[PDB]
Design a protein around this ligand. Structure first.
Ligand code: ADP
Ligand code: ADP
Ligand code: MG
Ligand code: MG
Lengths: 540, 539
């Protein structure tokens, strides 16, 4: 719905439409200064009247240019009010969207938003705004004589024809050529993440074959598109010259007879170059209209996605299907984790324990049943506020581009106090010291500039930042060393004495004692969930 | 460097000869205009009127052709340029992204797209007409002296406005573009971690951090277009006004005794062609601007361009990671004999993965040598070398595609070979339970798989091809009891196959199989000796 309405809010298009008209009227001046002169050459009044009409011409041209220059700065502001309102919604909606549709997710909505702003500022757009006021030119050429604009009609029927033809032989190629370019871009982006192994196992040429299934199909569309577009963009620019010259052909064949003023011989041809003018410039730069309309529809779809916790968690009749999953990954999960309770989630890798984690948090939505936090049904909590009360350390850690302090603070306001205790609790503090420029050390995208073991320590501090009521650690011991594990162990102990409801996905036995309740998963179903001492019995 | 590939082509002289003829053929619109006034003086009969018209039409049908061939050629020039640079950009991006992880993106492919667009665009044809503007200049002044002055004193005005347009946008187009890419890159990188973002609700927080790039892009995109358009507007109106002021002098010179009768218009027409190209240039200097950015960036991006028995040896090796000033490996000295196992243990951050990444030749040292069997400072072509090595990185780097493909390193799908590799790694047990097991669609990186499953497959890829050297960088992170048991069996079989295996792990079981052990600390190889010795001294 809002897809069109966000651009529809700007009603200045009439204010520019009304305005475009006034521009188009002054465009007659070069043609007025054509007839006005030959109505001065014959009467031979060179010294005075020409120069007034010259002054008239120059002055009106400054007025012409003035009424034409300010049109541009309006579309620019239109592009900003367009940008500012869409800018935030694009960046926020993308994160929520890239979880429901992880297959298709990139910064393309920005580049397309960028592509639109370019269209509004582009010269081709104004060439469209000049067209709805062409019937004025169609008239002034006809009021002088009927044999003239017959060419104007019959040339328009030929020029408009070529412009229409340019679409239907490139509409099917460009829309394809633009898209497959994005697929090739994304494929390379995803692959470049794994550049390390690609170089290790030298499988760059092997991936090149795989990459060619998208790129070779892009070129085949780009070649035909530009070729056919160039073929006809040339026919429209040259027909502007021939048709103008043919006006002299009939502007002489009918001017040797005094039906036409001796000066109107030329003025008639000029007006044709302007009736057929915008269409020429349109087809010449039709790719802008192409890619900005392709970029339009692309940014279009993307925008269609638009108390205090105490510790009780509950799952009732829960079935979860992962985004783009087809098959259910969690089947009939029934569990109630009381406040301040510890929970170890053990089991094999096919179990779906990270899925139970992701659905308890609310990352994944259950297709059946409900997830209740503090009895209250989840999805009623605000995503932005609910985050300050929960802690999360995923399996893939997921640190961000920024400094250590920023990361731990979830890129909130850097509270030198809050950050220290978070690092003191997680034990991350003793690692963050060693960094060149501790706490202020720059971490590359994802955390590439840091050891995975170090990353997880810092990733823990972030989880325990601001003393959350719920803590979900998903295999926080992967990549950790002896010290890092001792740190995690201490954090759990202190956390248990603070009475923080915690869930740890871990099979490390040293921490299994302080668990109270173990949950066993198997084949996407909750096989067992009871007191830890009771589960450990059943496990021997 | 990039230009030497453009300089390869000498067809630009054919562009020269053709563009030359175009400038001659562009005289007809005004010459035909003259031919009209020469019908009038004699009132030469009207069948002759349709004759010169017939001449004009047939001449224009040739004008369009010699001008559309340029479009047919420049179009072809862009393709043979692509096919020469296409693979080079793709294959180097992986090398580049390891040396330049900060600027690691698919951008260099996008810059290629921008150039191919520039060769096809109408704006480029305007540039090819400039060096023969003196032609129109000629007919204009040779006709009348006072006309030639206008053409000089006019050209100097648009050229002025055109040069103003340069150094008031040359500074912002570079920035407006550069930061939009870094805003793109930042988002993509940050969008990989959407899982936490949604969990901890820090999207608005990232937005504040992200605006340090986009707001600077907007302030650059805004000012660049505002300044550019204002100047482009002083060029479009000036062409219309300069053409009108030509008739201003065109009329004065008809009442004075001069042969200006009828060419009064032909001057304005020819002038419109002298000021024709530049008008179309400034109207779209954005393209020329962004292509110059795309040109240099892709040019800069392109500036970077027996069988092993299983003996590895490092000597005086000093390694500094990409984009770090400090060394991460300091004077590492060790030799791994063929078929010898090696455990790399040490505190987290001591530089184990670093020692791994340099043995494999991913990172290059600033000092010292990495020799494989013979003195071989990465003289191997990695495309051939990759067949002989197996690698399981800490981050378990799978790709979008089938398990089969991933295990085969996207080589030809050998129905047999994949399974033997899997049966070795123990992945075969796991791969089957997936629906249409061996031909499942693994999402990009393995999002559609449990990380615990991903590491099993990654081991199958490692082992596949019966590699001489096998490096496993912490292959037990996220492994089932069964999966850990599988890796244990895999290592046993590899030791019977006398493979030279380097396992980075501190697990109890593996240290017993591993023959020799290496202890790391502060990027210095603290120790390297027989396992039975070290293990006992770890008490
Ligand atoms: N992003 C995803 N999309 C679809 N299915 C998924 C996704 N991630 C995991 N799965 C499915 O869930 C299973 C793994 O569940 P997971 O929660 O990862 O268990 P664990 O925590 O033990 O690794 C796999 O069999 C896979 O089919
Ligand atoms: N990609 C990188 N860029 C720059 N420095 C790095 C990078 N990776 C690791 N380091 C540096 O090396 C140290 C850890 O080395 P690493 O190879 O991760 O050893 P380990 O794998 O045993 O942690 C860290 O202190 C960090 O400063
Ligand atoms: Mg998991
Ligand atoms: Mg490591």
């Amino acid at each position: 719905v809002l897809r069109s309405y966000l651009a529809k809010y700007k009603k200045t298009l009439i204010i520019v439409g009304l305005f475009s008209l006034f521009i188009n009227i002054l465009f007659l001046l070069p043609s007025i200064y054509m007839l006005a002169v030959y109505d001065i050459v014959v009467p031979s009044t060179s010294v005075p009247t020409l120069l007034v009409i010259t002054a008239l011409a120059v002055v009106l041209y400054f007025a012409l240019g003035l009424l034409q220059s300010v049109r541009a700065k309006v579309m620019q502001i239109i592009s900003l009010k367009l940008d500012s309102e869409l800018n935030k919604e694009v960046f926020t909606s993308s994160f929520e969207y890239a979880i429901r549709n992880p297959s298709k997710a990139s910064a393309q909505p920005i580049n397309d938003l960028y592509q639109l702003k370019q269209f509004l500022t582009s010269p081709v757009l104004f060439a469209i705004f000049d067209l709805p006021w062409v019937p004025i030119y169609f008239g002034v050429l006809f009021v002088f004589h009927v044999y003239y604009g017959v060419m104007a009609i019959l040339s328009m029927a030929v020029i408009v024809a070529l412009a229409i033809l340019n679409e239907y032989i490139t509409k099917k190629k460009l829309k394809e050529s633009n898209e497959l370019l994005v697929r090739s871009t994304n494929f390379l982006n995803r692959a470049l993440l794994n550049a390390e192994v690609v170089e290790a196992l030298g499988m760059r040429n092997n991936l090149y074959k795989k990459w060619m299934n998208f790129y070779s199909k892009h070129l085949s569309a780009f070649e035909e598109a530009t070729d056919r577009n160039n073929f006809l963009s040339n026919l429209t620019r040259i027909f502007r010259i021939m048709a103008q010259s043919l006006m002299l052909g009939l502007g002489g064949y009918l001017a040797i007879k005094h039906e036409i003023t001796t000066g109107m011989i030329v003025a008639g041809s000029i007006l044709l170059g302007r009736i057929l003018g915008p269409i020429d410039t349109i087809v010449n730069g039709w790719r802008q209209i192409g890619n900005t309309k392709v970029a339009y529809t692309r940014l279009n779809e993307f925008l269609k996605f638009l108390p205090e916790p105490k510790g009780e968690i509950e799952l009732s009749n829960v079935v979860v299907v992962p985004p783009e999953g087809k098959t259910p990954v969690l089947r009939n999960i029934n569990m109630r984790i009381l406040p301040g309770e510890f929970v170890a989630i053990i089991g094999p890798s096919g179990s779906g324990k990270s899925s139970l984690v992701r659905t308890i948090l609310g990352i994944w939505l259950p297709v059946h049943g409900t997830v209740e936090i503090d009895g209250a049904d989840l999805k009623q909590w605000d995503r932005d506020y609910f985050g300050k009360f929960v802690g999360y350390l995923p399996q893939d850690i997921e640190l961000f581009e920024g400094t250590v302090a920023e990361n731990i603070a979830r890129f909130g306001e850097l509270d030198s106090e809050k950050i220290i205790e978070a690092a003191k609790l997680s034990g991350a503090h003793d690692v963050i010291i060693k960094l060149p420029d501790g706490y202020d050390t720059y971490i590359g995208p994802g955390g590439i500039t840091l050891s995975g073991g170090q990353r997880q320590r810092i990733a823990l501090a972030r989880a325990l930042y601001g003393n959350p009521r719920i803590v979900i650690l998903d295999e926080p011991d992967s990549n950790l060393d002896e010290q890092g594990e001792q740190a995690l162990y201490n954090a759990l102990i202190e956390l248990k004495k603070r009475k923080v409801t915690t869930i740890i996905v871990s099979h490390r036995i040293r921490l299994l004692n302080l668990v109270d309740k173990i949950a066993i998963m198997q084949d996407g179903t909750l096989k067992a969930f009871g007191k830890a001492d009771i589960i450990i019995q059943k496990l021997l």
